[PDB]
Amino acid sequence: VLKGVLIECDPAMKQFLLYLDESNALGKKFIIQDIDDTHVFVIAELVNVLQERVGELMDQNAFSLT
Amino acid sequence: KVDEYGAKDYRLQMPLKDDHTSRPLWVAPDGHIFLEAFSPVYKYAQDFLVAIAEPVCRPTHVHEYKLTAYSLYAAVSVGLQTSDITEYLRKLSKTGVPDGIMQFIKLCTVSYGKVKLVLKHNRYFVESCHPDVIQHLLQDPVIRECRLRNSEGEATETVSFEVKQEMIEELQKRCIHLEYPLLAEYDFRNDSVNPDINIDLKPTAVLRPYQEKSLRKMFGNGRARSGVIVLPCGAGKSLVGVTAACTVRKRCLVLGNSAVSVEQWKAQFKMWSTIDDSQICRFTSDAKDKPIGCSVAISTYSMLGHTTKRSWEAERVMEWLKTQEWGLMILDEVHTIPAKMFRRVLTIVQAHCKLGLTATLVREDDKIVDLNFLIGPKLYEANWMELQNNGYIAKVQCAEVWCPMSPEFYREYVAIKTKKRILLYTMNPNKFRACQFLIKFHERRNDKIIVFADNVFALKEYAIRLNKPYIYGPTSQGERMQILQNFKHNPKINTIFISKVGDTSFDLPEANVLIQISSHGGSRRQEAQRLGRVLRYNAFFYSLVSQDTQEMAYSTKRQRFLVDQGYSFKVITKLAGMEEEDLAFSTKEEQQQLLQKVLAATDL
Amino acid sequence: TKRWEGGYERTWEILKEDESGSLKATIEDILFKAKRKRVFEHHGQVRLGMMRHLYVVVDGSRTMEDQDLKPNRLTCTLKLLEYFVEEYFDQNPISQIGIIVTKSKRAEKLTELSGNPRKHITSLKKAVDMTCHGEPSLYNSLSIAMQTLKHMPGHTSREVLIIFSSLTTCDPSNIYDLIKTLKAAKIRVSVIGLSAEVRVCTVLARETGGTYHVILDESHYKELLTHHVSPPPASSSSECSLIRMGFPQHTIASLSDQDAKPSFSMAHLDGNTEPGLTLGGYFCPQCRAKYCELPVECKICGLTLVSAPHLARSYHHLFPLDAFQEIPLEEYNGERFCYGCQGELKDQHVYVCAVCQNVFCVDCDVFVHDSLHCCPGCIH
Amino acid sequence: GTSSQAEAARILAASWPQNREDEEKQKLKGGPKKTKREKKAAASHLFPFEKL
Amino acid sequence: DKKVKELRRAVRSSVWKRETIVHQHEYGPEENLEDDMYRKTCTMCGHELTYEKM
DNA sequence: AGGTAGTCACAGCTGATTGCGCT
DNA sequence: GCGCAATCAGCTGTGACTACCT
Ligand SMILES: [Zn+2]
Ligand SMILES: [Zn+2]
Ligand SMILES: [Zn+2]
């Protein structure tokens, strides 16, 4: 059996996570099991780097007025 | 000066809040003006601020203006004096003018009329009332090259001397750095040397009050000064130029951007100036209607600044044209004046007054500052919100509706980064479905539709899929003209596609719906021009972007000019009745088939 | 010279200060200048009117199938005609509308000349799905209109409106003789074309005293119809014009009383649908006939049934309210409370009526001159 | 096919901005509108294709 | 040269169909660690999959 | 440890060539 | 055979992406 964290999101973010897995942008293949087109299963020891990558992707194409 | 919350606070600087709030204005120490629109004195305060400063944003409640040296030069150019402007600013301050503006205003306004530039007998001279300033600038190395041969003293009468004609731009750039800005005043009332023409506009072309204000500010004390007037394309822009040309009553030269804008200006002159066709000439190497010996000449850029070999007839026409003075040289689409070859155009012809007209003064590369000395100060800036409130400008309901990225496309979008992702978010199936739904809806409600789409490679399959007319751009001259001519007066066809061709001042007919897809990156000028093609909720225009892509950032950063103008972009996330009818790319098979044909570019 | 080439206008020179704070008072005057932006007249045009027997002629040729106005000319024309009928009956209490349709070189009287608004709208809605065939015949429609309107009393203004879509008409006889006959009969004919100007329509409108117009778009069509809505001006005193008309009271029937007699409406009896068997309605003052709609002329005794409020709504034009004398507050020596709203008088100007010498504030003066149309003080 | 149509519609019409908006609507007012003024303002500010 | 260049790539770009390599992890025999832990190693990319089997 | 001349896409213009039409 | 219109070469504007020195 597999123990970790279930992540639910839109298919675009799921595919972004898949690309991160295949490109080894986090340094390893920790994105192990894919269950649904909109749900994935990720080991919980590196949820922080995934959050940082998601935030960087989100605010990259944002053009903050600050 | 203090940064307790990261905000520049000036509470201690301006405490003069005597009694008590009746003045709807706030001043800033460095420089800024905040105006309250919901005031009984709103019109008078607006008129006062327009004549002295240029706006930086005009929302519905609190306008914000900026104080600049060129704005003060324009203010002092009009009959307004230093004492009057200072006392009226102090009159409506509600907080007290900080002691950093009065000194700044005084310094800007002191050196206005000290140095003047004049044109006489095809010769450029610089005249100064005070002889000392000439010796002040004599030691400047850049100026000394203008005189030839050294212009020992040029004893006249008031001290003046000749300058090199082709180096006028350099001295214009230097003078402002020397705190001695030049002024371009043409006293056309009494010349007796220039052959004035018998142009006279018909007394049937009435003009709106804002055009009256712009013209009145152009001619403040019986003389015409070079300036820039910014008016929307739908509003009356050519009429202002025609009226200015008639008032100047001199030989007029009009410069357009495209080879079709010259015909537009000729039509405007024939409509509102009552000028015989013999005097009107167009010099664009198409008919050559004897431009030699003409009163009004109309031509375009990229023809007066050729660095290559020129046609034999064109060479003689240019030689004749460069041998006489010009009255009120009119430039169209002045925003694209600061170019590598367009700047020298003003140096290749000699004219007294240079009047520039445009609708979108915003431009990248921060070269608009150069336009302050290339032509003159920003004279008039029309308020678009109050313009559309009077009903003479269509109130366009702006919309920014985005579509999610399809799963078959987002993987490729995140996979590639070397400039190959443009087609991926340009040809988003969801955006295609949204565009098709909008087209069908506005055809069912019978609205004229213009669909702007750059990246014509995508526009090909975007337009042939719906089997609708489109303008590739490198097609021909007749086909585009006939398509645009039959677009308006034909009930069967009411939707057209334009690929970066309509990004200028053309003769496109009235339309109510504009849909832009995959435009340039941050071209605020392009989006403002596209919006200008609609106004003339009577109308409304949509912008389609793809989520989680660079197009979102581009749309966010390109709409700031319009929100400064006062428009608001409502976000639409769901389209009502999207699944009510059948649209293209309904199933995943054709969506995944699209990947092969969109990656089939392989431009390597 | 030119007006804008002289001196630049400084509109901000109006405001002045003398006590370093008086500017507020000035803007107060601006607020007082903000009000009174009207001419104290909701219409401001014709102060009287005259009865009209208007005939609307509708083309039914193939040209109505053109899609210049979405979806086609016929549909937009009938929609705007329904709007015109509603507005015309709203602004004319005792007028009448007849409808003629020209088709296949013939003229058919779609609806008889009457004052019922509902009947005409239903007839137009039924005629929406008609078949457009043949070519129009202005001669037949004009002959029918003249024949019907020939016997109308002279005081009534006889008007004919023609909506001419097709550019060609088939005339079985000379039309200029008909035009001369219409001119001798004092009939006003106005034409609103759809495609382009036609010589015969222009000549007819010029000779009969009417107006000929050509549609630019749907908005211009509606503007022309609205212009035709307004009644023509009438003389101060023309003739002995009087008409016998009744005023039916809207008596409903309740089972609590013993005088509840159900009855079928005379108008509803003539319809194809089942007549409404309602408790009660409008009873004719002459023959006690039951009707459900007003104003409807009685079918039995020929009397006209008109609602009194409709006639009374235009009485304020006969007796316009005289403008009150504007008096500054300081110069008035009296009570400082408004006679109408009982509010304290603080404005710089106080209005006093010339009859009752009562004081009204700006708001009360505007309300009286715009809506009330009667001085409350003079009522007492 | 018919199943492909439904799958594509499910993927498209509810990808990012529905998985939370629909849930919020399920947990929303539910009852009638606040005032008629709100409905009039919403109708004025809505686009013609969103009112059909 | 232009008219041959415009057609030389037409057949070049019509051959390839699948660009992305198949990432299906074909794990080999499981390796048993302590505490009933089982690790699977991908023979294509070296992905390690550690799981507890009941 | 952080910024600008080539380069690319997509349009414009003018200066020649260059095959097409013939009561 | 001559004349008009279609076509391309060369240059430029606009906006954005990218490889070596303070
Ligand atoms: Zn009766
Ligand atoms: Zn009152
Ligand atoms: Zn009274």
From Swiss-Prot, chain A:
Give the Phosphothreonine positions (modified residues). 66
Extract one GO BP annotation from the record.
Answer: transcription initiation at RNA polymerase II promoter
Q: Which Pfam families match?
A: Tfb5
Q: Where in the cell is it found?
A: Nucleus; Cytoplasm
| Key words of the record | Cytoplasm, Disease variant, DNA damage, DNA repair, Ichthyosis, Nucleus, Phosphoprotein, Transcription, Transcription regulation
> According to its record, what are the GO cellular component terms?
cytoplasm; nucleolus; nucleoplasm; transcription factor TFIID complex; transcription factor TFIIH core complex; transcription factor TFIIH holo complex
**Record-linked InterPro entries:** TFB5-like_sf, TFIIH_TTDA/Tfb5
Instruction: Quote the disease note of the record.
Output: Trichothiodystrophy 3, photosensitive: A form of trichothiodystrophy, an autosomal recessive disease characterized by sulfur-deficient brittle hair and multisystem variable abnormalities. The spectrum of clinical features varies from mild disease with only hair involvement to severe disease with cutaneous, neurologic and profound developmental defects. Ichthyosis, intellectual and developmental disabilities, decreased fertility, abnormal characteristics at birth, ocular abnormalities, short stature, and infections are common manifestations.
What family is this?
A: Belongs to the TFB5 family.
Q: What is this protein called?
A: General transcription factor IIH subunit 5
Q: Which organism is it from?
A: Homo sapiens
Q: Lineage of the native species?
A: Eukaryota, Metazoa, Chordata, Craniata, Vertebrata
Query: Coding gene?
Result: GTF2H5
Swiss-Prot record, chain B:
Q: Which domain of life is it from?
A: Eukaryota
Miscellaneous: The TFIIH core complex from patient XP11BE (a patient with XP/CS who has a C-terminal splice-site frameshift from residue 741 in this protein) reconstitutes in vitro transcription about 30% less well than wild-type but does not restore NER in vitro or in vivo. The XP11BE TFIIH complex has all the subunits in the same stoichiometry as wild-type. Purified mutant protein has very weak 3'-5' helicase and ATPase activities. In another paper the mutant protein has wild-type 3'-5' helicase activity. The mutation is recessive to wild-type.
Write down the CDD domains for this protein, in alphabetical order.
DEXHc_XPB, SF2_C_XPB
* Leader sequence segment: none
* Keywords (A to Z) from UniProt: ATP-binding, Cockayne syndrome, Deafness, Disease variant, DNA damage, DNA repair, DNA-binding, Dwarfism, Helicase, Host-virus interaction, Hydrolase, Ichthyosis, Isomerase, Nucleotide-binding, Nucleus, Phosphoprotein, Transcription, Transcription regulation, Xeroderma pigmentosum
Explain the post-translational modification: Dephosphorylation reactivates the 5'-excision step. Phosphorylation has no effect on transcription or the 3'-5' helicase activity.
Establish whether keyword DNA-binding is in the entry. yes
Under InterPro entries, the record lists: ATP-dep_DNA_Helicase (IPR050615), ERCC3_RAD25_C (IPR032438), Helicase/UvrB_N (IPR006935), Helicase_ATP-bd (IPR014001), Helicase_C-like (IPR001650), P-loop_NTPase (IPR027417), XPB/Ssl2 (IPR001161), XPB/Ssl2_N (IPR032830)
Question: Which amino acid positions bind ATP, per UniProt?
Answer: 231-238, 533, 536
The chain residues annotated with the modification Phosphoserine are 568
This enzyme's EC code(s): 5.6.2.4
As for subcellular location, the record says: Nucleus
Q: Top enzyme class of this protein?
A: isomerase
Q: Does the keyword Lyase apply?
A: no
UniProtKB/Swiss-Prot annotation, chain C:
List every position bearing Phosphotyrosine: 88
Tissue pattern of expression reads: Widely expressed, with higher expression in skeletal muscle.
- Tell me what effect the entry lists for residue 284 to A: Reconstituted TFIIH complex lacks p62 and has no transcriptional activity
Print the keywords alphabetically.
Answer: DNA damage, DNA repair, Host-virus interaction, Metal-binding, Nucleus, Phosphoprotein, Transcription, Transcription regulation, Zinc, Zinc-finger
Q: Quick one: where is this thing mainly located? A: nucleus
* Chain positions of all zinc fingers (C4-type): 284-301
Q: Which cysteines are joined by disulfide bonds?
A: none
Cellular component terms, GO, for this chain's entry?
Answer: core TFIIH complex portion of holo TFIIH complex; nuclear speck; nucleoplasm; nucleus; transcription factor TFIID complex; transcription factor TFIIH core complex; transcription factor TFIIH holo complex
The VWFA domain covers which part of the protein?
53-229
Metal-binding in keyword set: yes
Gene Ontology biological process terms in this record: G protein-coupled receptor internalization; nucleotide-excision repair; regulation of transcription by RNA polymerase II; response to UV; transcription by RNA polymerase II; transcription initiation at RNA polymerase II promoter
Member of which family? Belongs to the GTF2H2 family.
In Swiss-Prot or TrEMBL terms, this protein is called General transcription factor IIH subunit 2
Q: Which organism is it from?
A: Homo sapiens (Human)
From Swiss-Prot, chain E:
- Tissues showing expression: Expressed in various cell lines and in skin fibroblasts.
The subcellular localization recorded is: Nucleus
Explain the post-translational modification: Ubiquitinated by HERC2 leading to degradation by the proteasome.
Q: Which domain of life is it from?
A: Eukaryota
Q: Would you identify the family this protein belongs to, as annotated? A: Belongs to the XPA family.
Functional description taken from the UniProt entry = Involved in DNA nucleotide excision repair (NER). Initiates repair by binding to damaged sites with various affinities, depending on the photoproduct and the transcriptional state of the region. Required for UV-induced CHEK1 phosphorylation and the recruitment of CEP164 to cyclobutane pyrimidine dimmers (CPD), sites of DNA damage after UV irradiation. During NER stimulates the 5'-3' helicase activity of XPD/ERCC2 and the DNA translocase activity of XPB/ERCC3.
Complex and partners: Interacts with GPN1. Interacts with RPA1 and RPA2; the interaction is direct and associates XPA with the RPA complex. Interacts (via N-terminus) with CEP164 upon UV irradiation. Interacts with HERC2. During NER binds XPD/ERCC2 and XPB/ERCC3 of transcription factor IIH (TFIIH), bridging the 2 proteins.
What is the name listed in the Swiss-Prot or TrEMBL entry for this protein?
DNA repair protein complementing XP-A cells
Its organism's taxonomic lineage begins at:
Eukaryota, Metazoa, Chordata, Craniata, Vertebrata
Please specify the portion of the entire protein covered by the chain, as first and last position out of its full length.
220 to 273 of 273
